[PDB]
Amino acid sequence: ADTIVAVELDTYPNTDIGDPSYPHIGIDIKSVRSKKTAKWNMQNGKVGTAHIIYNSVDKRLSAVVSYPNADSATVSYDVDLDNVLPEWVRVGLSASTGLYKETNTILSWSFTSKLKSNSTHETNALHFMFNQFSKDQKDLILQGDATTGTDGNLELTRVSSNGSPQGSSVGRALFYAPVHIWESSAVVASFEATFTFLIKSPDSHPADGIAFFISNIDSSIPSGSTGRLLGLFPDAN
Amino acid sequence: ADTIVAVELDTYPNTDIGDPSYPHIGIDIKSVRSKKTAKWNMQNGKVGTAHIIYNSVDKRLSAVVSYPNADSATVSYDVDLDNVLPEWVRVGLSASTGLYKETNTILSWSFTSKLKSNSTHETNALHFMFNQFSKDQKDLILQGDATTGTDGNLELTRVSSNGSPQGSSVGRALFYAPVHIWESSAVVASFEATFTFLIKSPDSHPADGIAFFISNIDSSIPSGSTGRLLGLFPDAN
Ligand SMILES: [Ca+2]
Ligand SMILES: [Ca+2]
Ligand SMILES: [Mn+2]
Ligand SMILES: [Mn+2]
């Protein structure tokens, strides 16, 4: 299987697989059963911001999700990324729909990674920033139903031409360049991601969510990973 | 054939193909015959710094090659890069030796690209920075004789264990993620590149040079592009 570390914006409560009974943000370490979650007051049809930090100093993964003029939702987990991920990774955005559906629109995405040797005391770094997505976006690997260029946006899941989102949809976008995330247990990268998103549903119950993830460089959408598996995990274990 | 735009650090006068009769820095638009050149007092065995800038407003490509406690060679040329390069490119470093030979050691390399949209006026950007190269550098495409990780350095051309360069050598390194250099109507990226290099020789005629180049994504070392062609060009037209 793939090795996945993720921050999930989970719209749909799957209580039979350990989700809390409400929309939530979570940190996922090699499992869709979040190691840590916080209640998320998702606003159907509003543009929100996601802010994620891995701080190598504390070995702490952090995520804040917020809407303008509302209080944020936050989650944090201590994890040795050197002991979980391979040395080289791709970073991406994933989304899914199931029986229930939502638009999974990404309007912007930025990422920074810094890896600094103890010996040199000098840093290697990668930064990209998309404020607009292009019809033929060659620095992104699109998987499943993911498309770009509609209103300059990244549509992670299938939307019809009238604007209606579709069920049983999955789609991912990975940055083309692989990212160097550790050299030893003592030298680990810090990174920062931001994205803005628009989750719109006609349904009383939107589903299933958006995730920022780090995987092995050759990661692909697992078979049957629509709905509650967020296009990340082969099963709900 | 490939489309090349390149800034050359040319250490060997090839006077039968347009070179001045001294070492020089040149701006190459689609030809090893520079559009503009400047005399360059190359210092054998000494670490130097190259700074390339392209400004999409002035439409000017500048370069500054410099050495500690010595003068700076600079060269300029106004060009409209939407006239020359494809929408998407790879950026890279190239070097070659021929009959005469030099080390083409790269100690650091950084690049920034910035593309301001027109309909919505938001910017997309790529930045990377290597202060050390490792042995399997998965964000670099190595071509020809180029290797990484010897002294934490990028060796563009073949070198022996004792540290002696070898002739009839050619090598390149391209950043793995392609770069968006222009949008359709006079919306072109500005960019900046910086590298530090050590060109060294037991000769007093070192050859043949190092170049920063921008190419079509699929570009490879042209056949018979050792020595004077800088691993950039197939013919001397
Ligand atoms: Ca769920
Ligand atoms: Ca020459
Ligand atoms: Mn969940
Ligand atoms: Mn020349």
From Swiss-Prot, chains A, B:
Cross-referenced CDD domains, in alphabetical order? Answer: lectin_legume_LecRK_Arcelin_ConA
Modification after translation: The mature chain consists of residues 164-281 followed by 30-148. To form a mature chain the precursor undergoes further post-translational modification after removal of the signal sequence; cleavage after Asn at positions 148, 163, and 281 is followed by transposition and ligation (By formation of a new peptide bond) of residues 164-281 and 30-148. This maturation (circular permutation) relies on the legumain AEP1 activity and leads to an increased stability of conA after heat stress and at various pH.
Output the SUPFAM superfamilies linked to this UniProt entry: Concanavalin A-like lectins/glucanases
- Organism's domain of life? Eukaryota
What species is given as this protein's source?
A: Canavalia ensiformis (Jack bean)
The identity of this protein, by name, is Concanavalin-A
For this protein, the record's InterPro entries field holds:
ConA-like_dom_sf, L-lectin, Lectin_LegA_CS, Lectin_legB_Mn/Ca_BS, Legume_lectin_dom, Leguminous_Lectin
Which of this chain's residues are annotated to bind a carbohydrate?
L99, Y100, D208, R228
Which Pfam families did the record assign?
Lectin_legB
